[PDB]
Structure 1
Amino acid sequence: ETTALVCDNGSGLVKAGFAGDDAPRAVFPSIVGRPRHQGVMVGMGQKDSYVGDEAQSKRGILTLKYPIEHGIITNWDDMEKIWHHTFYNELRVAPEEHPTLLTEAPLNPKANREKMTQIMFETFNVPAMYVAIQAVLSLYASGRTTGIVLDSGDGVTHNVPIYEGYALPHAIMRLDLAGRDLTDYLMKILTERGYSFVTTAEREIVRDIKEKLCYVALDFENEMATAASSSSLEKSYELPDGQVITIGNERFRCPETLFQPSFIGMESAGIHETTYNSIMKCDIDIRKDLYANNVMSGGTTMYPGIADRMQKEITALAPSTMKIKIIAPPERKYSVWIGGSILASLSTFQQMWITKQEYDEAGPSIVHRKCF
């Protein structure tokens, strides 16, 4: 037993863990914090930085940053801290003893893949490591090699057509709207309902509301009308001290924002339109199978009724005689991570790792050749 680590680094959350486990052991915010101003902060500890949960608790003392913007790594100093923290603090492992699988976003620059492998080998001294495309891992996990993945996480929503294990970069759509935007709109319209959520302690509370009560309407105006003229679909939410507030049309208006981004000002096609456009940018031929295999991944696709709604919208955009299916696995919230764990635990995967010797001889990249 040497054991492989699997890391799926997203904009909002890190999912991390041991290959062969069926769920990620560590899930914590992809947040790095540093002293708010120059001199001596109080009570900054004996430390120059915090990561994850600690960084949230001390938000008042630190300046908070996300090193992964829209799936891409844009702050490497801070990204090193998240990795360090993942190994030592979250996982309790010594990186040099463990093969590490890492995941990457759509449209990720080749140079980024290289510095990523570089840092793993140079700064963390992993014996072996390997890099996999998130979207492909989820597709494969659903039991298919061709289809169009709709990955929607915390800061980005991607539409990614994949043929035979290969993402088609020219047809990949990016939409900068996801979970963190949805929590904030839920916060806004809940406060307009006469409650008050400003406030980072409260944002947490709204995230839980959002995650437990929200749903996607099959027909939105039907549902708005079904709510205005009846108290039928009103769930009550237990505040953590004891107050009880009543939540109504917010319950579906919030993720409606996915299909109707004008809701938060933004001029942009909705997820149904972006997944249609993505498809449309491919072969006339391949299109058939894209439609037939829409896979969904990521926490922001976890809303009830999202699958069916997509079915409705896609159909309405497609040639009438089109075979359309959405696949929304129960495991889709960590399907990217589960797929890496499954892969990195196989004996037959031992000879697929990029090794230190391979990297020395050289160098970083190795990565484009050996991983795809």
Structure 2
Amino acid sequence: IANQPVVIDNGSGVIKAGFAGDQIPKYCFPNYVGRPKHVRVMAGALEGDIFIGPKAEEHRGLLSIRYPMEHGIVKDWNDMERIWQYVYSKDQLQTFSEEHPVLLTEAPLNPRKNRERAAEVFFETFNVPALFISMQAVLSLYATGRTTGVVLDSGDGVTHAVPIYEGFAMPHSIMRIDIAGR
């Protein structure tokens, strides 16, 4: 647990997350994996063959980049699993799955099966007590504070403009194109 859970923002290119009650997502990092390509000549060197985070943002030309989420849709689910595990790390979480009523976002206009598979992971595999996932615009309604609005959020690989009214948008007044500067 009955303490600070984590708010997790998506991103096909950069995923975000952070401990609740704060004002900045405590940990933000891109949505890909870095795996090298050279012979382990000198033993005892950088080994593990899978880098995410500082080594990924460090050993740029030393790895092999692979984004698991495309057009805001994850297809390399196992890579996102490992990315979640990077979030679970001692550098980031230092917790277990059974410790918080964690939060997560999800942009609309998506098949439920994605969310279903994520639920299967975070509930069958991870024994998360409570993991909520919502849209990606009420968050902005809280930030702006206003009730009536037209929320636009330029995602990592998505764009979607939706007019909401007091946290109740039309289930039809929804505009979206999965695109960005990529």
From 172, 175, 179, give the equivalent of 2:175. 172
Q: Give matches, 1:1-372, under 5 Å.
A: 2-36=3-37, 40-41=39-40, 45-88=46-89, 89-168=91-170, 170=172, 171-178=174-181, 181=182
Q: RMSD of the TM alignment (CA)? A: 2.5
Cα gap change, 1:42/1:96 in structure 2, threshold over 3 Å: closer, same or farther? farther
1:11-33 CA deviation, whole Å, 9 max, x = no partner?
Answer: 23222111111211112222212
Residues 164 and 170 of structure 2 are in contact (CA less than 8 Å); yes or no, is this contact kept in structure 1? yes
Q: Which runs of 5+ in 2 are unaligned?
A: none
CA contact (8 A) 1:7 1:102 kept: yes
For residues 131 and 115 of structure 1, the distance between their equivalents in structure 2, rounded to whole angstroms, comes to: 13
Q: How many Å separate the matches in 2 of 1:61 and 1:169? A: 46
- Distance (whole Å) between structure 2 residues aligned to residue 16 and residue 42 of structure 1: 37
In the superposition, the TM-score normalised over structure 1's length comes to 0.43
Counterparts of 1:174 and 1:134, CA distance in 2:
15
- Kept after mapping to 2: 8 A contact 1:145/1:164: yes
The amino acid across from 2:10 in the alignment is N
CA distance in 1, matches of 2:71, 2:141: 20
Contact kept, 8 Å, 1:17 with 1:91, in 2: the verdict is no
Helix, strand or coil at the partner of 2:64:
strand
Q: Deviations over 1:67-113 (max 9, x none)?
A: 22233323211111111101213232223212210111232221111
Q: Deviation per CA, 1:145-181, whole angstroms, max 9, x where unpaired? A: 4432110133322222334434545432215123xx4
TM-score (ref. length: structure 2): 0.81
SS of match in other structure, 1:53: coil
Match of 1:358 in 2: none
State the shift of 1:60 in Å.
2.9
Partners of 1:35 and 1:167 in 2: CA distance:
46
Q: Is the 8 A contact 1:41 1:61 kept in 2?
A: no
* One-letter amino acid matched to 2:114: N
Is the contact between residue 4 and residue 100 of structure 1 (CA under 8 Å) also seen in structure 2? Answer: yes
**2:70 partner amino acid:** E
SS in 1 for 2:98: helix
CA shift, 1:134, in A, is 1.1
CA distance in 2 between counterparts of 1:108 and 1:34 reads 30
Alignment size in residue pairs: 177
Please tell me whether Structure 1 or Structure 2 has the larger radius of gyration of its CA atoms. 1
Structure with higher strand content: 2
Secondary structure at 1:93 match in 2: coil
SS at match of 1:79: helix
d(CA) in 1 for partners of 2:24 and 2:61?
32
In 1, are the aligned partners of 2:9 and 2:104 still within 8 Å (CA)? yes
- 1:118 is paired with a residue of what secondary structure? helix
Q: Which has the higher helix share?
A: 1
CA contact (8 A) 2:72 2:178 kept: no
The aligned counterpart of 1:194 is none
The answer to whether the 8 Å contact 1:136/1:167 transfers is no
Structure 1: tracts of 5 or more residues without a match: 182-372
Counterpart-to-counterpart distance in 1, 2:40 and 2:141:
47
Does the aligned pair in 2 maintain the 1:8–1:16 contact within 8 Å? yes
Q: 1:142 to 1:127 in 2, by over 3 A?
A: same
Tell me, yes or no, if the aligned pair for 2:158 and 2:176 is still in contact at 8 Å. Answer: no
